[PDB]
Each structure stands twice: as structure tokens, then as C-alpha cells.
Automatic annotation (TrEMBL), chains A, B:
Binding site for L-tryptophan: E82
Superkingdom: Eukaryota
Species of the source: Fusarium tricinctum
Pfam short name (any one): Trp_DMAT
Name under which the protein is recorded: Dimethylallyl tryptophan synthase GliD1
Annotated residues for binding of dimethylallyl diphosphate: R97, K181, Y183, R245, K247, Y249
Keyword Ribosomal protein listed: no
InterPro entries attached to this UniProt entry: ABBA, ABBA_DMATS-like, ABBA_NscD-like
Biological classification of the source: Eukaryota, Fungi, Dikarya, Ascomycota, Pezizomycotina
GO MF entries: prenyltransferase activity
Amino acid sequence: LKAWASLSLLLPSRGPDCDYWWKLTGRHLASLMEAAGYATERQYEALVFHYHWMVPYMGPAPEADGKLEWPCPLTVEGLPIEYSWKWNTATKRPVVRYTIEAKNRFTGSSMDPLNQDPSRELLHRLQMSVPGVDLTWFNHFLATLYDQDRSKYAQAVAAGAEYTTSIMIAAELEPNGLTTKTYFIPQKVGLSLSDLPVSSLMDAIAGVCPQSAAKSILEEFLTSSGGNLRPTMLAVDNVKPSDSRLKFYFQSPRTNFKSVRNVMTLGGRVPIAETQLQDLRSLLNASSGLPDDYAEDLDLPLAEHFSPPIMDAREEKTLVLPGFGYYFDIAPGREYPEVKIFLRLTAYGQDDTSMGRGISAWMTAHGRGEYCPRYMSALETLVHGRHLSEGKGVHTHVSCLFKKDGTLDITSYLVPEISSQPQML
Amino acid sequence: LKAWASLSLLLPSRGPDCDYWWKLTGRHLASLMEAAGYATERQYEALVFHYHWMVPYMGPAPEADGKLEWPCPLTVEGLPIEYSWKWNTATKRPVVRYTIEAKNRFTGSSMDPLNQDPSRELLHRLQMSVPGVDLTWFNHFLATLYDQDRSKYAQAVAAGAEYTTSIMIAAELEPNGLTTKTYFIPQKVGLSLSDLPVSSLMDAIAGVCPQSAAKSILEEFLTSSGGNLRPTMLAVDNVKPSDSRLKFYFQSPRTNFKSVRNVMTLGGRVPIAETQLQDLRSLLNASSGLPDDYAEDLDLPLAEHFSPPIMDAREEKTLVLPGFGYYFDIAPGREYPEVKIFLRLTAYGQDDTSMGRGISAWMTAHGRGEYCPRYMSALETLVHGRHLSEGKGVHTHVSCLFKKDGTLDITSYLVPEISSQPQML
């Protein structure tokens, strides 16, 4: 770990909170970056960027009780960070990225009850300092996905409402520099996200994308055989809007593969080659430890010998609820939505070692095994207070999206586990 | 300039003073490091170290009048930084280092009239953060080279005394990591440094080096044919004392080469091969634009068509006074002093281009030309508001020390020139 050892001796100490997150998550990024074959120069830049721009926004260190005043749904322990490992393809090495929730001293207070001001400030300071940052859609969705009179959210909190994370921010450490994305979890003063009609969200979407074939294909799908999908999230890239994706996330209670076929083809409107679909289904069964011929009409079985927090998840906290996550990318000028499916590895599958080996076997079987032993090893540096094989807690999702060349883009979403007394064994 | 372009887009803005010095001197270090063939990884580390540890201690930005409340004798413009270029040998690439004076808001005030507290804090914070920092000799020379009742210096300032820089700090960016050095300019409440007896300084030296052959050889030299040398400075390395050099700097009014022979051999006590001495003399004549056969009995002629601040220099401000600088390294366990001579390129020689080409011709003539065109080019990025050939201001010294293998260790000491209205043309 040359980059991390060097940089962490040259970068000064700064206060207990920054030092906590820098030491905990800076080392994790370095392990993942090293396991993925990142050059030392690329590692230095990412770690330097992490130290100065992300760590200061990660808020307070957790307490001895691994407790935080404003916990984040990215983790069963509520930590404000999630890593992702995009798997190597034929033509590219793995890509390491991560997401944070931005926090400050007023996070969650009556002046900022949905904790949105630190993200505004982080993205604006990045825009003033680094080229190519565009916040048109960021600012538009701030104005339209939420009630605007903050004192309405405060009155409701004064009546027992439990508001949580609304915005998260990602920097991509992809081969060309870095660009940013924003995630919005909509929340209103009087109703649940589950109660939020899709139509209101689509009205907000119509403010920047009034028509597109992809959008029209998705709304036709949603009023037919897509009716069981519940909206959960929206994401944008903070770049020139004509270059930005427009990701509309949904929760589906069903997990049988027949349902997967339905969602990913948008009810047959957007066909997918059967060899690609069968490859996805192989990955889904290998990841959750099911027989390779698991029936296409059967829902996946919930993990149970793991006591996960299923009753604590919802649309606003999608980490641990039964079902699949999806997004539909419906950006303007798209002929059809791009679809990504998210298998929830907190709710399905076995321990982290089995899950990582299931994904590894799939990669190996498809000639992408190049980096699996390094990935398994890096996983072990992410959990503190247990072995990787004793329970769940590092893996949160594995995702698949069918690229325009038939290629399966696969991503492991990973989370630090800190607690000395693990909560899923 | 890949490292500098990358790093200076990832490192945030911080306040006008830090931003001034980072943009001005961070780019200079990058040019010198690039011209010397520094790998990108080494460049990132140095620039990161510069940004966090040195820049914040460089104090206020100069004013529109290129003015500073507490100016530093490193520069005719008083800037608190000097770079050095150690020339390539047969076996090593050039080495880029620099020196700063550490400053804070109380610099020069009645509570810190010799401006020593920022250096204490910088070195202590480095010691707490980076391994191998030892401050035994630093603290010893703080206690013995100065009067200790600060309110005596303040009374004297209340009577028109003009106290100046007392301590400067260097980080070496040598092939193995980085280590630190400290320079002490002694100053007392009632007498000039020129009036400071050598004996009092040697008493301070005896506190950490009570006897050594090198020390004894130097005091025999100084009471015989060395009697015209005036002490100016002491330096230590902030490392384990048994690994530290112990550099005792002197000013000599004479600059004829017969005098050089006398000083560098310590009055014949430490012989030097005649081919090494004649090589030095060639470099001295080439650097100051004199005929190669300049007589060994003639003092060098002062530059004049350059209006330098000769009447403003003294023992405490050795940049521009007639004569040579020397140091004698008399560390314990040394059989004989190591001697380094400093030719003052502010007082002797022609414009910066001629001086740089004189040194370049010498290097080329001795088969060390490898990097001269890159050095000439880097020089041009150091002066603002004039061309390198129109006057003096970048070069401050060129130095030579005879290594234990006959090798001539040669260093160019360089300074940023900022003023739009240059003061030496």
C-alpha cells in the first residue's frame, strides 16, 4: 500500500472526526484501488481528493456505541459512505467509486431538516474549483422533489416524523479524471415515499426532460405490468445536461426471474438477447447461493439465519427490503431506457465470503476472473470485528446492466463494517 | 507539468496568503523538479508536503509594493523562500531543495521579537507526525545563541534596534524521503553579530560537541591565518545527533583564490588535490564572467552595473556583501572539517543568463552537462517582470564542497523574483 503509507505520513492530522474517516475509509479506498491495479499516480490523486473534499463532509465520527445522530441508509450501521467495485470487462480494469452523504453541524436541525445544505456547499465549491461541474438539474430537483417551506418539516418533526437522508453525492474515479453524481430521495411533509405518486415525480422530471422515447416507453410500462413498481430515488450526473444520465429508481417486491424479464425488457418493449438474460440469471443464482436451475417462476428466498433489519427498511431506506431494486435511465435523446438491476445482498444470499465467491465463480466462468482473488482479499480489509465468512455486512448489492454491445456491466457495492459486535451473523 | 496541473486542481483554495505562496512557489518547485527529471510520484509527494506543511508557515503575502512587515534576507526583495539546485554527478540526478522562514501573526511582536515560535511549532508538529525528527540540537541552540529574556529585545526595539530573521528551516527532497535542517542566525540584545566573539558561539557548540578533531582543527585555523573570518550562522540537521552535521558559517572579506586555498585547506592542515582546487577556480572564474586565468592573488571585482544592495547587507544579511561565504562542518567523530564555499552571485558576476551559462559551460566541460538546457529554461520561469538576461535576481549563490571521493558537489541557490519593477538591472 505505497500510496496510502506515503500520503498518510505527509497529510496532517486535523481533528478527531476528519481523522476517524480518513483513517477508516482512506485505507479502504486504497485497498480497493490497489486490488484493482490502480497506478500509484491515480491512487495519489484519488486519496488526495478524498482527504480534502469528501472526508470533511462526512460529519461526526460514530460514538463508542457506533451511533450517529443522523444515520445514513447506505449501511445497516448507518455510516455515510458506500464503495462500489465495477468489475473488469474484456477491455478495462475494475473501477473503484464511492458515495457519501454530506453533513455539517446543522445537519437535521430545524434550519436544515432534510440535510441538504452541506451537499449544496460541497458541489458549489467543487464547481468553483474544478471544471465541468453543472448544477442545473441538481438545483431543479432540490426545488421540485421536496416541500420548500422548511418550517413545515420542522412542525412535523415536532410531531414525531423521522426524516432521513435526502441527498448523497458520488465522485467517480474513472480513467478520465473525476465527475460527480447526485442522488435524491424524495420526501414530503405529509405522506410516505411509498405514498408519493409516480406522477408527481414524473412532473419534476418533465421540468428538464419533457419528452423522450425512453421516458414514454417507461410510462407505458408503468401503467401496464409495471404497476407493482414503487419509486424510490432519482440520480443525475452533475455535468452539462445534454451529457447527463437521468436515473429513475424503483423498488419491486417480486424477485422471480419472470419478473426480472418483465422489468428489464419493459414489458417486451425493449428486447434483450436470451443469452444475456440467462447470463444475468446465472449471476443472480450464484450470488444468492441458489441452484443454477432455480425456477424462473419462484421468488428468491429471504436470508434468515442472519437476523437482518428487514422491518427497518422502506422506500427511503432500500438497503434491506424484500424485492429487487432497479433504475431506468430515461435521459433525453435516448431511444429506450437503460435498465440496471440491483440484487440486495443484505436480504438475499449467504455470508459475505459465499457471496463474493459466488460472484467470483461467475466472473471466472465468463473469463473475467482476472482479479477475483484480489477482490476477495480486499473484502477482508473492510470488516472489523469478525471474519468475512461469519455473516453479512460488507456486500450491500450486486448490479447488472446490459451494455449496448451485449456486454454485462457488473458492480459490487461494498460498505465498511466497524462494529466490534456485528449485527448480522 | 502534469503533477502541478493535476494537484493544483484537486487541492482547495485556502485564503489569500496560502494561495499566493502555493501558486507562486509551488509552480517554481514543480518546474525545478520537472527540469531535474523527478518522477511524477516524487513530485506529488513534495508538492503535497509543500502545500500542507511549508506554505501555511510562509506568512503574509507581500503587498502591492512587494512589501513585507518582516522581510527575510534570503532575497533582495525579502521573500521567505530560497530554492537550491544540487547539480547532477556521475551517479545521481539533480536534487531540488528549498528553505523558508516560518512566520505567524505574532512574528516580530514583543512576545516573539526574533520570530522563533513558528519554527518551534512547525518542527514539533512535524516531529509528532513524521518519524525521525530530533530537536535536541534545535532546542539547545535556541537556548544558547540568544538572550533569553524577550523583554530585553523589546526594550531595544523601543530604542531603534532592527532585529531580523533568526531561524530558517529546510526540507530536503532527496532520494530517500525527506529530513529537516535548521539555520540559526545569532543575535544578542546589545551587540552586532560582527561584534559577537567567535568564542561565545564555540561555547554554545561545546554544549553538544565538546571535542572533535574537526573542531580542534578549525579553532587552530581561526587563531592563525583564519583570523579575518567572521561568524555568520550555524546549521544542524534535525535528526539523531550522532547522525547530524554541525555547520559553522563564516564570512570572509577576501575573495582572491590564494585566500580560497587558505580557507578550504584550513591553513594547510587539510590538503586538497590541486586538480580539485583548479577545478573550483575554473568554476569561480566562469561563474563571475572572469578570464579563466584570473590571477590567484587578485580579489574578485564587485559587479557594479547592477546597483545591488551592498550597503544593506551585513553578517545577519549575508546575501549581498563583498567576500565569500563558507561553512565548516565540525560534527563529532569527524577527522577534519568538511568545507563548503559560497560564491555570492548577487555581488559578483553578470546577469543571470551569463551566470547560468558560465556554470553550464563548466558542467558541460566536466561531462555533467546532461541537464543544463533544462536548468536554463527552468530559471526563466522564476523571474516575473523581466527577462533572465537583463539583470540579477534569481541566482543568489553557487557553492562547492569537495566530497570524500574527490567529487565536486556543486549547488545553485535560486530565489523567486516577483517585482514588476526589478531592482537589479
